Amino acid sequence: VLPNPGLDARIPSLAELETIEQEEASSRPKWDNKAQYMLTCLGFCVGLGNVWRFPYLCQSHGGGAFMIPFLILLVLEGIPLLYLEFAIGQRLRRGSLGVWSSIHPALKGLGLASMLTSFMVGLYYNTIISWIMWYLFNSFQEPLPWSDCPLNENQTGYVDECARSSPVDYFWYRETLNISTSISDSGSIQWWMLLCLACAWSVLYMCTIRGIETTGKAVYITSTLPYVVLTIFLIRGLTLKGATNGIVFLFTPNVTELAQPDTWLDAGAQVFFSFSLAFGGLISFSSYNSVHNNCEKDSVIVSIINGFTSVYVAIVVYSVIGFRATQRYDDCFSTNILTLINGFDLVFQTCDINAFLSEAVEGTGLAFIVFTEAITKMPLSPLWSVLFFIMLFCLGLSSMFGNMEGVVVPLQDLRVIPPKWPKEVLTGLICLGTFLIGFIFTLNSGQYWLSLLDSYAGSIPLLIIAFCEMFSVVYVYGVDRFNKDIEFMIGHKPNIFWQVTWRVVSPLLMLIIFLFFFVVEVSQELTYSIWDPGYEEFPKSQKISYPNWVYVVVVIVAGVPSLTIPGYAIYKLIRNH
């Protein structure tokens, strides 16, 4: 509907697609088998971002008061984008930067904002993978290192921190992070963390060395192991002890918080992190399929698995949450019994079970504090620790293949490295570059920096890219051409569910969410949680205000990608003059 002259020149002819699959055998990559593509989509729409984020947000709002908005916006904003990205990639036979640049030359900004976003989410998730590997490397020890405290110079006093806190809390904050008392206290580089980061990047490079030539074989183990091990943990979880108590707790949501715009905003932004939408990897990956590939059926199958896996992982977390709360209730109970037995042959504790289940975990605690403590209480605790960190490591890796795709393909399409040089060279330099940037999260104050990416700074860009993709495919390229295109690829025009969601519903929902993501989220003061053993009520939570200069970080990490979209468009409409 917007005037777009010259479109037919830039994009492949519909008749040219019938004479491209058997003559572009070289120059362009091909999936060996549809299984390889489906296993790659599984790993990118159900890696971390689904399995890591969803469960945290469940327990940070409400067990079931968050799944409702999540599953509504999965259907009405996620399935439509997922289909759109799959189809547009399959038709225009290019990556994100090739696709938006060919729909209109002023939209090369859309593709640069996806490459930067993909860069930033890869930098975040590979630090989480370096932590996961630290814990996997300490999981080959009969007494898991986080099960016991250290000691004093007298070798008769437990470390006061550990004592005032827990071996788990102390192994996370002191033995792993060696955390400082604020973001201003940088300290220095934790060498043992640096070794784990190098390991994460180096494994990723081994799997992504020749893009889909190598990542397509990696996914046979990396997108299949996580799901079997998560099945083993579902069965272990349900038979834990108080597990059924926890699972009743996420299926009795308070509805008073289903009316909280934050629950809707987090669910909004979770739909794009869950599916890895607006990163651009999905467009590149769908561009290597046959032009007659059924992208509608693929988007639906991926979606159904995404929603089902979201709810499944919430069951595995809450069974373990329920187990922890019940062993506290009991413990606390058994000490209130022991106070009057020690007094009568009188201090007491108030500990109902609903006060323990509804005790939120800040940061990455669900993985390195709750699941780690509960694995030590299980028999063969070292075999459950290794399975848990191997599951998470493979999920991380599967997700990292998509995020790497979304940085490598655009840099190939910007022709910035000599074409002569093998891709292996380009992949390697991205791994080295991002490895060096990730030294900031190896500092004494690293977690604090990683928690800034957990702010709205990590989300605004994703909401802006997704909207612009939808808008540009429907109004700049034209939904009518797009329907004739799909009808050519799969044999039938997309039905009225797709027409309503693309033209009105999805764009309008995205707009509302972006608008009210500033009316509340951005307007609120950015605060974070510090671990300082010199704090009154020490093992308790002291949230403080970030310094002013961190605004100079959120302002770029989010702004730049977002502003790349118009910024490049305005550059292109003043070079024309």
Partner: protein, 32 residues
Amino acid sequence: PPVSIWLIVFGVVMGVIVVGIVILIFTGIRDR
């Protein structure tokens, strides 16, 4: 422990990975 067990695990994993990287580089060159 005379050696920390995480360093024995890291060494073996990192060794396997570097041998992987080297095999895949020489394989890629040999694919003519």
